[PDB]
């Protein structure tokens, strides 16, 4: 019953956080989604209306229900412009659902195709991976519940979470599953009519549940995978052996849950593990772990590089906190008082969530804006106080 | 008369309880707060010079210079193995190669409007509830005012002198709740911060 105490202790600390938000953020928007989301992905488009005090940003959210109909969600976020101020505690329209498409099961992950962001792949609790074109379905859903996935993709025996669209190769989509396999679908050529598509290739390397999968950002033939193997694998599509990857790295001391490649480096990537640390890897030499980001107090499930900064990285886990790391800060001299707070590499802690953070996304248009969604149904659109990373 | 603990003590403990708890897992770094700015001894200039590709070369040099049926799935909670609830040198270990004159402030405690018990902590601007060294007097007041809202802090200057009048706040009480699996909520936005 220490869990019942843990509840008040959480809320006393949520109050303290709230009270200080003005001194830690340039922006905090907090929204209770009708049903909680297991995914968050900032869409790349921005509507900048003529002479308005804001911009329109869109998000690829989803649902998770307790015996209710599930949806593929696209909501819209109104973000203020630099000159403009505006403050609310909603009655106004700031965050709202644009489209709610019928989905058959809770949305594990939802990721848009970089090439055509109208196309969204989804990881479903059922074996199959679905692809929807939000333009191909109405903005107001069908009350029948009748979910018509534009394309169905079979090859997995179980559900999973890892999902990656190849940037440099249109239609190439990768899935990670509890079935130890990675499936590769090519929808580009082979679009046809036939709603069901069987995987082009299946990667049977990992010895436990495959947690994540992501393509490399410059090589179209390279991708990485992490499993409960406590390992990270570097795969080359070009190779004929679908059981052996190019490299199998002993990444962590526990279950690795996520990987993210640096958008500025063709070598750097990071991995998030159950071992409560983020590991830094260089593709050039995988025999050496570059560094272990220490601060998380529980399992890490999402590790993501900031699009706007080469040295900025963020991580979210089961400690209800999201940490922001600056590599440029690694091994900097700290005062005993400075040291007291955290490693120099630790730039920021986001204490706005009262529950485990499921996903988070860096806004691709507004530097330092992050969307972090938790199981308590809360969605935050935050941005840390500029003085934290900026110098006059 | 020591009846003052009937108003105080309880909050003093809630804050002492949280001191041990918050040291373990923070809600924020004190150094990140705008009023705690000075805690951070370091700067941001090392970033426009920093190139992540140059990191391996350094690590290599370092190493070289060494001679209701609710199933709790690990990712979600769907409504042995998979906890069931019913209520009706290896790369593996941690690697960190690139790392390796005194003022007196009086605290006047007020209880049932009047009656003041005055404790002085000449220990500079250290927080009486969470031990933290606020270092600067402006910071201490903000710290107290925001991190200890169960109390009402009022600064009074005097050439003798300086004092913080501590009373018990009378208006205290997206939160946490007892949830089994997924829960339906009523959608509502809130803008907590918005700086131009
Ligand atoms: Zn304190």
Q: Is the peptide bond before B161 cis (omega within 30 degrees of 0)?
A: yes
B132 Cα–ligand 1 center, Å: 6
Instruction: Name the β-bridge partners of A35.
Output: none
- Contact assessment for residue A372 and residue A13, using Cβ atoms and an 8 Å cutoff: no
Q: How far is CA A42 from CA A178, A360, A364, B49, B126, in A?
A: 26, 9, 7, 29, 43
Two tokens, residue A359: 């996903």
B162 Cα–ligand 1 center, Å: 19
Two tokens, residue A137: 């379905």
Give the resolution value in Å. Answer: 3.2
For residue A142, the distance in angstroms to the closest alpha carbon of chain B comes to 20
Query: How many angstroms separate the CA atoms of A335 and A328, rounded?
Result: 18
Residue A223's φ and ψ, nearest 5 degrees, are -155, 160
Query: How many angstroms separate the CA atoms of B194 and A158, rounded?
Result: 44
- Contact assessment for residue B180 and residue B88, using Cβ atoms and an 8 Å cutoff: no
Q: Which residues contact B65 (CB under 8 A, 6 or more apart)?
A: none
Nearest alpha-carbon partner for A155 in A127, A186, A130: A127
Distance of alpha carbon B185 from the chain centroid:
29
One of 2.130.10.10, 2.60.40.1180, 2.40.160.40, 3.40.50.300 is the CATH number of A1-392, namely: 2.130.10.10
Q: How far is CA A282 from CA A225, A255, B6, B53, in A?
A: 15, 20, 60, 8
Partner-chain contact A310 B50, CB within 8 Å: yes
A27 Cα–ligand 1 center, Å: 25
* A290, A370, A371: best to mutate for the B interface, most B CBs within 10 A: A290
The 8-class DSSP code of residue A218 comes to S
Partner-chain contact A106 B76, CB within 8 Å: yes
Assign A210 to helix, strand or coil. Answer: strand
- Contact assessment for residue A163 and residue A213, using Cβ atoms and an 8 Å cutoff: yes
Q: How far is CA B185 from CA A31, A33, A77, in A?
A: 11, 7, 19
Q: How far is CA A51 from CA A58, A81, A94, B70, B122, in A?
A: 20, 10, 17, 51, 56
Partner-chain contact B95 A301, CB within 8 Å: no
For residue A223, the distance in angstroms to the closest alpha carbon of chain B comes to 19
B131 Cα–ligand 1 center, Å: 6
Assign A103 to helix, strand or coil. Answer: strand
Q: What is the CA radius of gyration of chain B?
A: 25
Distance of alpha carbon A107 from the chain centroid:
13
Query: How many angstroms separate the CA atoms of A286 and A300, rounded?
Result: 21
Partner-chain contact B56 A7, CB within 8 Å: no
Provide the 10 A C-beta neighbour count for residue A188: 14
Query: How many angstroms separate the CA atoms of A200 and A178, rounded?
Result: 19
What residues of B are in contact with residue A334 (Cβ under 8 Å)?
Answer: 41-42
Each domain of chain A, given as residue ranges in start order, spans 1-392
Query: How many angstroms separate the CA atoms of B49 and A114, rounded?
Result: 31
Residue of B nearest to A352 (CA): B27
Query: How many angstroms separate the CA atoms of B95 and B83, rounded?
Result: 33
What residues of A are in contact with residue B135 (Cβ under 8 Å)?
Answer: 337
Query: How many angstroms separate the CA atoms of A26 and A4, rounded?
Result: 34
Query: How many angstroms separate the CA atoms of A96 and A246, rounded?
Result: 45
Partner-chain contact B194 A86, CB within 8 Å: yes
Q: B10-24 and A2-20 helices cross at what angle (nearest 10)?
A: 90
Nearest alpha-carbon partner for A74 in A104, A126, A39: A39
Which of A22, A378, A390 is the closest to B193 by Cβ?
Answer: A22
Q: Is the peptide bond before B84 cis (omega within 30 degrees of 0)?
A: no
Where does A274-354 show beta strands of DSSP type E? Answer: 277-282, 291-294, 300-305, 312-317, 322-326, 346-350
Query: How many angstroms separate the CA atoms of A392 and A199, rounded?
Result: 53
Partner-chain contact B187 A34, CB within 8 Å: yes
What residues of A are in contact with residue B181 (Cβ under 8 Å)?
Answer: 66
Residue of A nearest to B135 (CA): A337
Provide the 10 A C-beta neighbour count for residue B8: 18
Nearest alpha-carbon partner for B106 in B178, B154, B69: B154
What residues of B are in contact with residue A371 (Cβ under 8 Å)?
Answer: none
The dihedral sign for the CA sequence A41, B75, A321, A325: negative
Partner-chain contact B196 A82, CB within 8 Å: yes
Residue A324's φ and ψ, nearest 5 degrees, are -115, 125
Nearest alpha-carbon partner for A280 in A259, A264, A263: A259
For chain A, first and last CA: distance in Å? 50
A320 sits in the region (left: phi over 0; alpha: psi -120 to 50; else beta) called left
Query: How many angstroms separate the CA atoms of A264 and B47, rounded?
Result: 14
Residues in chain B: 196
Partner-chain contact B194 A85, CB within 8 Å: yes
Two tokens, residue A244: 């052996």
Query: How many angstroms separate the CA atoms of A348 and A24, rounded?
Result: 9
B134 Cα–ligand 1 center, Å: 9
Residue of B nearest to A347 (CA): B32
Q: Which residues contact B91 (CB under 8 A, 6 or more apart)?
A: A249, A250, A251, A279, A286, A287, A288, A289
Query: How many angstroms separate the CA atoms of A260 and A305, rounded?
Result: 7
- Contact assessment for residue A258 and residue A238, using Cβ atoms and an 8 Å cutoff: no
B127 Cα–ligand 1 center, Å: 5
Query: How many angstroms separate the CA atoms of A282 and A268, rounded?
Result: 5
Two tokens, residue A88: 């609310």
The H-or-E segment that residue A123 falls in is strand A119-123
Which of A288, A331, A347 is the closest to B60 by Cβ?
Answer: A288
Instruction: Give the domain extent around B149.
Output: 1-42+101-173
Spell out which residues have Cβ within 5 A of ligand 1, the ion.
B 127, 129-130, 147
- Method of structure determination: X-ray
Residue A61's φ and ψ, nearest 5 degrees, are -100, 175
Query: How many angstroms separate the CA atoms of A273 and B185, rounded?
Result: 31
A189 Cα–ligand 1 center, Å: 62
Assign A317 to helix, strand or coil. Answer: strand
Return the HEC string of chain B. CCCHHHCCCHHHHHHHHHHHHHHHCCCCCHHHCCCCHHHCCCCCHHHCCCCCCHHHHHHHHHHHCCCCCEEECCCCEECCCCCEECCCCCCCCCCCCCCCCCCCCEEEEECCCCCEEEEECCCCCECCCCCCECCCHHHHHHHHHHHCCCEEEEEECCCCCCEEEEEECCCCCCCCCCCCCCCCCCCCCCEEEECC
């Amino acid at each position: 019953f220490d869990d019942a105490v843990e509840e008040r202790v959480i809320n006393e600390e949520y109050k303290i956080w709230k009270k200080n938000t003005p001194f830690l953020y340039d922006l905090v928007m907090t929204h209770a989604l009708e049903w909680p989301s297991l995914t968050a992905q900032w869409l790349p488009d921005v509507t900048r209306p003529e002479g308005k005090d804001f911009s329109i940003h869109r998000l690829v959210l989803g649902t998770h229900t307790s015996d209710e109909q599930n949806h593929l969600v696209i909501a819209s976020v109104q973000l203020p412009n630099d000159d403009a101020q505006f403050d609310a505690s909603h009655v106004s329209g700031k965050i709202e659902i644009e489209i709610k498409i019928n989905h058959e099961g809770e949305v594990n992950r939802a990721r848009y195709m970089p090439q055509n962001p109208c196309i969204i792949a989804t990881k479903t609790p059922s074996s199959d991976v679905l692809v929807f074109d939000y333009t191909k379905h109405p903005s107001k859903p069908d009350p029948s519940g009748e979910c018509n996935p534009d394309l169905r993709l079979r090859g997995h025996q179980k559900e999973g979470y890892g999902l990656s669209w190849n940037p440099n190769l249109s239609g190439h989509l990768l899935s990670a599953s509890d079935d130890h396999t990675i499936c590769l679908w090519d929808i580009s050529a082979v679009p046809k009519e036939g709603k069901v598509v069987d995987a082009k290739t299946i990667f049977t390397g990992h010895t436990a549940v495959v947690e994540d999968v992501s393509w490399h950002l410059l090589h179209e033939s390279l991708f990485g995978s992490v499993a409960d193997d406590q390992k990270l694998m570097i795969w080359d599509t070009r190779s004929n052996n679908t059981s052996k990857p190019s490299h199998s790295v002993d990444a962590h001391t526990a279950e690795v849950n996520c990987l993210s490649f640096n958008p500025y480096s063709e070598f750097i990537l990071a991995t998030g593990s159950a071992d409560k640390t983020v590991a830094l890897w260089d593709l050039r030499n995988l025999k050496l772990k570059l560094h272990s980001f220490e601060s998380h107090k529980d399992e890490i499930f999402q590790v993501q590089w900031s699009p706007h900064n080469e040295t900025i990285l963020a991580s979210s886990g089961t400690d209800r906190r999201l940490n922001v790391w600056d590599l440029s800060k690694i091994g900097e001299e700290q005062s005993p008082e400075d040291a007291e707070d955290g490693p120099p590499e630790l730039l920021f802690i986001h204490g706005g969530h009262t529950a485990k953070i499921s996903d988070f996304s860096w806004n691709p248009n507004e530097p330092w804006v992050i969307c972090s969604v938790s199981e308590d149904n809360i969605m935050q659109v935050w941005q840390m106080a500029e003085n934290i990373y900026n110098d006059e | 008369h020591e009846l003052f603990l009937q108003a105080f003590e309880k909050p003093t403990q809630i804050y002492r309880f949280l001191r041990t708890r918050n040291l373990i897992a923070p809600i924020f770094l004190h150094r990140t707060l705008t009023y705690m700015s000075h805690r951070n001894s370091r700067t941001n200039i090392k970033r426009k010079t920093f190139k992540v590709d140059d990191m391996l070369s350094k690590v290599e040099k370092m190493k070289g210079e060494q001679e209701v049926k609710v199933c709790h799935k690990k990712r979600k909670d769907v409504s042995s193995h998979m906890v069931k609830s019913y209520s009706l040198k290896s790369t593996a270990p941690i690697a960190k190669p690139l790392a390796t004159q005194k003022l007196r402030i009086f605290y006047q405690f007020l209880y049932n409007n009047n009656t003041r018990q005055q404790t002085e902590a000449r220990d500079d601007l250290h927080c009486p509830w969470c031990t933290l060294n606020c270092r600067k007097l402006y910071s201490l007041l903000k710290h107290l005012k925001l991190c200890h809202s169960r109390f009402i802090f009022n600064y009074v200057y005097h050439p003798k002198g300086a004092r913080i009048d501590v009373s018990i706040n009378e208006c205290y009480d997206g939160f946490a709740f007892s949830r089994n699996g997924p829960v339906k909520r009523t959608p509502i936005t809130h803008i907590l911060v918005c700086r131009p």
